[PDB]
Amino acid sequence: TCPEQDKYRTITGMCNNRRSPTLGASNRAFVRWLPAEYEDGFSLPYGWTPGVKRNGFPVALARAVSNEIVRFPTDQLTPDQERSLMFMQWGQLLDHDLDFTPEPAA
Template identity: 50%
Template sequence: MLDLFLLFRQNTRWGSSNRAFTRWLPADYQDGISRPRGWTPNEKVNGFILPLVREVSNRILAGSNDLESDPNFTHLVTIFGQWTDHDLTFTPHSPVIRSFSDGIDCDASCANTEPCFPIP
């Protein structure tokens, strides 16, 4: 039987606060260094042009409005969403190493200008 007490005693920082997430897969940047995939419009990734993120989420979440709600699952999904949001929201971020030399507000700009990466 696995002794969890011993496991966590040997790895005391697992699950602790103020720790960044562990990267499970290597980073995959468009330029091999720092640009996210999709930065350059119409550039193919594995032979395909990446779709807009908003288009993908709209297609996944599209549905009819005539579905009946199930109160047992609706509340569970809400609680799980809150738990996930709070877990991710309070994860430490690495500091931005690029300067905002042009005074760009990334929340308001749709330009592909570092350090902003807009999701249209």
């Protein structure tokens, strides 16, 4: 069980929350703020089976959305007058302190 006295964090996050010692610890499931939405109810994502609609409408291919909505000509990029590129890098650095979602290896 978690030691009654604690000077430092464990590496894995174990024993931060003493009543529930895995909360925030590593190699644990994500919490869900909303229940998952999957084609079959429990494991297959929307876009898996061809012809299966989502909430009455066909599933848009992600790459199609990306072409029609995200694409823009590179020469017209607007530079943010009030943010440095360090604003961008801290976000990625900070992202990599909070979460990494493993996926299988090739």
